[PDB]
Amino acid sequence: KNLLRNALVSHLDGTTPVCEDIGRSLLTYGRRIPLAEWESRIAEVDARVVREVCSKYFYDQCPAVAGFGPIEQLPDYNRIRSGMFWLRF
């Protein structure tokens, strides 16, 4: 959470980065999300939210893999797929 707060605040530094956030956000969120609001969103998050949210998107989900280069040892898609769940859990 702290990393993300740092990132956010740090990223919004100077005319350009800000201007770009305005214009782009208007496109995407319809409005401009005031720093404070992001800070509130981040604060809400804690371990449980992470586990629940991570599981929702990553747990036992099908990956899209892209490879390039000396990839002979890149694991087979089945194998990568199997790595998206744990037999302990």
């Binding site: 694991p75 087979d76 089945n78 194998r79 199997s82």
Partner: protein
């Protein structure tokens, strides 16, 4: 770090059937290696449960087996799975060696050779196996065969009586065979691992004989599940026998105890030695017959020295492909003759089949190979 790779034990297991790279290419003819493995353990496993009830001693031998079949809770399925698994162990052994020649696998000298050692040992084992119940076939089967060493010049006599423990088959011979039938499958099991060790040195051959390095897949998923399905099929077959046709492949007269006085004009070793049986007696010679019987199997170790073709698999070799099937059918012939009495048609035809066998493997296939080279401009 992944413990599945650095732990002294798992390494072996990772290398055996998890990370080992295999041809994306192999087909059903490659399953008989797992099947032989399965066979070996299941054989060891039922075999052991029979030993907790079996005996030895010529007096009780037959009695104990029936005891098992009738009295021992479930002793029957165990007994019959053992006896039927034994046949299956030959069907696979046979198929394995088959797959091998066709596809040129024998080019892995050490591996092939260990496999020949694996063949003689399970043969030697299964032989001793059927002497155990002490039936009619068991007694003269144990007699007709063993004797053969009496054809060996100068010392034949000595050895056959040394392996006997007397002057004929009795007391000393049943206990002996039981013990040997017990220790062999363990020794085989070791040899198997060395067989498999040398195999991992090159990885597996494939239907094209080309070289799959350019397209390997992980044993993980792929060949583990294609081995499971496969094993299920082997179970279907083994169970079909045991549960529907228990004595279909079994000589009905190994029932009725022994009797050094009798000998029932018929008598042949278990089906899987018929082709060999046919060869031996298709020769009017004590020395020649047994000499020819030996060559009949020890010729496998000769095959690689007569590879003549510039291609490895027979996948693209019609000429040899024909001589291969002629070999199989001809072996099916020898099996059939072996199963018949030494009389009119049966003699001369089994005599022709023998010559064919040796002439085919020793002259025909090697020539078919060279002609194919010449046809391709190689």
């Amino acid at each position: 770090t992944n413990i599945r790779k650095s732990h002294p034990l798992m390494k072996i297991v990772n290398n055996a059937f998890i990370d080992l790279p295999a041809p994306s290419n192999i087909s059903s003819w490659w399953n008989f290696g797992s099947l032989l493995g399965i066979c070996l353990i299941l054989q060891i496993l039922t075999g052991l449960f029979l030993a907790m009830h079996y005996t030895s001693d010529t007096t009780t031998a037959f009695s104990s087996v029936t005891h098992i079949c009738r009295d021992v809770n479930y002793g029957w399925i165990i007994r019959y799975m053992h006896a039927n698994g034994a046949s299956m162990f030959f069907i696979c052994l046979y198929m394995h060696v088959g797959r091998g020649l066709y596809y040129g696998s024998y080019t892995f000298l050490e591996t092939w050779n260990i496999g020949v050692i694996l063949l003689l040992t399970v043969m030697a084992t299964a032989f001793m196996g059927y002497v155990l119940p002490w039936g009619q076939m068991s007694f003269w089967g144990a007699t007709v065969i063993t004797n053969l060493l009496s054809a060996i010049p100068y010392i034949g006599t000595n050895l056959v009586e040394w392996i006997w423990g007397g002057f004929s088959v009795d007391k000393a011979t049943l206990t002996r065979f039981f013990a040997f039938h017990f220790i062999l499958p363990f020794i085989i099991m070791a040899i198997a691992m060395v067989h498999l060790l040398f195999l991992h040195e090159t990885g597996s051959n494939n239907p094209t004989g080309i070289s799959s390095d350019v397209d390997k897949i992980p044993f993980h998923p792929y060949y583990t599940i294609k081995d499971i399905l496969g094993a299920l099929l082997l179970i279907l077959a083994l169970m079909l026998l045991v549960l529907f046709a228990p004595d279909l492949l079994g000589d009905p007269d190994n029932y009725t105890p022994a009797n050094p006085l009798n000998t029932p004009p018929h008598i042949k070793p278990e089906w899987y030695f018929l082709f060999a049986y046919a060869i031996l007696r298709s020769i009017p010679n004590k020395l020649g017959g047994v000499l020819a019987l030996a060559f009949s199997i020890l010729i496998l170790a000769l095959i690689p020295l007569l590879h003549t073709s510039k291609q490895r698999s027979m996948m693209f070799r019609p000429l040899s492909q024909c001589l291969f099937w002629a070999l199989v059918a001809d072996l099916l012939t020898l099996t059939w003759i072996g199963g018949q009495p030494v009389e009119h048609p049966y003699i001369t035809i089994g005599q022709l089949a023998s010559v064919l066998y040796f002439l085919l493997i020793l002259v025909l296939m090697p020539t078919a190979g060279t002609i194919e080279n010449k046809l391709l401009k190689w």
